[PDB]
């Protein structure tokens, strides 16, 4: 199973998904037919094996299949790790998912486009989201250099080398690529083999994981005798799951009693464990998994339990309706073409609270210096005290990242 979770942030159509395609081969389908005329809409997914040509020279030595006879010669390249990506979208409005997605990342790669004006809205929006949440292991990548003047791509490298200054980004290297002709990718594999190291994770910890997809495997027409179980897609972060454990989903489904609202935890047994297309008996952090369950697939068709989390059955986690955020703001709104200066929070305001993978909406009851109290539509299961969150506002119809903080219990 994949070791680590690398995110591919960046502006729209700079080719994020395409770079993922030159590295893994995989496409994100582009599906729902809509994505097929549009672009990536769900987080894309893909894995790959990285081995190295010991017996020759780098960066090219950075292989993809147990095969060195591609450069230098034969000695079956030694396997270093198997990684996984998370292709976000790029569109100014899919912000709410990409946020969500970051919660699973262990690091990232910023795909800038070589033939369009460097700090483009979303490129920045993302970047600062990254420095905000904590994803400090970053690799910037100059993509479409296969369509530019040998001057242009260097001058952009300048504007980049200059942005990457005051900001937290010391030597966040910048590896220009050609995602279309798959050129220079091996030096990218060498970057990502140096800088995006694979974090240790104490297993002993409480089994905890985030959900960002879920599907009804069942084909149109499979008979009831072999209706395969409900299936939950997401990423582990702390602990480890095993085939046949007893598990629960939070906050879980809400009931209806004449206009009332009431969420509650779903229990089931891990029917099965799969990464990529291959089945495993257990599952550990870094990667996305999919969990076969024994629950009515109705319950997780389209992607229902989106923004839900899975933990040990009989485990101690709060299903809050009201939450204490400590918090800070950006001075600007890096995400509108316009940089208008962030207005301080007024109470009785509706704000998107992005917590973990989930995306919830909520209203402001308290306004202090860096501690506001929020009332939520859909509960948040707060698994830790360390719960990072990301805070947004509907500036001009479309929502916008404006500031952050820490959940507090």
């Amino acid at each position: 199973q994949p070791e680590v979770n690398i995110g591919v942030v960046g502006h729209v159509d700079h080719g994020k998904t395409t770079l993922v395609q030159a590295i893994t081969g995989i496409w994100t389908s582009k599906h729902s037919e809509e994505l097929k005329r549009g672009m990536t809409i769900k987080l894309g997914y893909a894995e790959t094996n990285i081995g190295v040509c010991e017996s020759c020279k780098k960066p090219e030595a950075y292989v993809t299949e147990p095969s060195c006879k591609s450069c230098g010669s034969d000695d079956e390249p030694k396997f270093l790790r198997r990684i996984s990506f998370i292709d976000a979208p790029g569109h100014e409005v899919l912000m709410a998912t990409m946020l969500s997605g970051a919660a699973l990342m262990d690091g990232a790669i910023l795909v800038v486009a070589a033939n369009e004006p460097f700090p483009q809205p979303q490129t920045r929006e993302h970047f600062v989201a990254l420095g905000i949440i904590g994803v400090k292991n970053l690799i910037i990548v100059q993509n479409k250099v296969d369509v530019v003047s040998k001057e242009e791509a260097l001058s952009q490298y300048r504007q980049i080398k200059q942005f990457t200054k005051g900001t937290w980004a010391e030597n966040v290297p910048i590896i220009p690529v050609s995602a279309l002709h798959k050129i220079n990718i091996d030096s990218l594999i060498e970057g990502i083999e140096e800088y995006i190291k694979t974090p240790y994770r104490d297993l002993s910890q409480k089994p905890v994981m985030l959900v960002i997809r879920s599907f009804d495997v069942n084909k149109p027409g499979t008979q009831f005798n072999e209706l395969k179980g409900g299936v939950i897609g997401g990423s582990i972060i702390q602990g480890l799951f095993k085939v046949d454990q007893e598990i629960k989903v939070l906050p879980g489904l809400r009931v209806e009693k004449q206009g009332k609202v009431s969420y509650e935890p779903i229990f089931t047994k891990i029917s099965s464990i799969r990464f990529g297309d291959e089945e495993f008996k257990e599952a550990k952090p870094g990667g996305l998994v999919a969990i076969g369950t024994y629950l009515d697939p109705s319950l997780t068709k389209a992607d229902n339990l989106l923004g839900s989390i899975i933990t040990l059955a009989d485990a101690e986690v709060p299903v809050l309706w009201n939450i204490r955020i400590k918090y800070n703001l950006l001075e600007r709104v890096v995400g509108a073409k316009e940089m208008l200066k962030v207005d301080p929070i007024r109470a009785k305001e509706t704000l998107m609270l992005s917590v973990g993978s989930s995306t919830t909406l909520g209203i402001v009851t308290s306004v202090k210096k860096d501690e506001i109290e929020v009332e939520l539509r859909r509960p948040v299961a707060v698994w830790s005290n360390n719960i990072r969150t990301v805070i947004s506002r509907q500036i001009a119809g479309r929502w916008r990242m404006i500031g952050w903080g820490l959940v507090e219990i």
Binding site: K348, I363, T365, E375
Partner: peptide
């Protein structure tokens, strides 16, 4: 009339009392 007013007063009250409750 007093139909009007009672529900206007009630709506004002609720909506505002909603804004106070919130």
């Amino acid at each position: 009339m007093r139909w009007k007013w009672i529900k206007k007063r009630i709506r004002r009250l609720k909506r505002q009392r909603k804004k106070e409750r919130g």
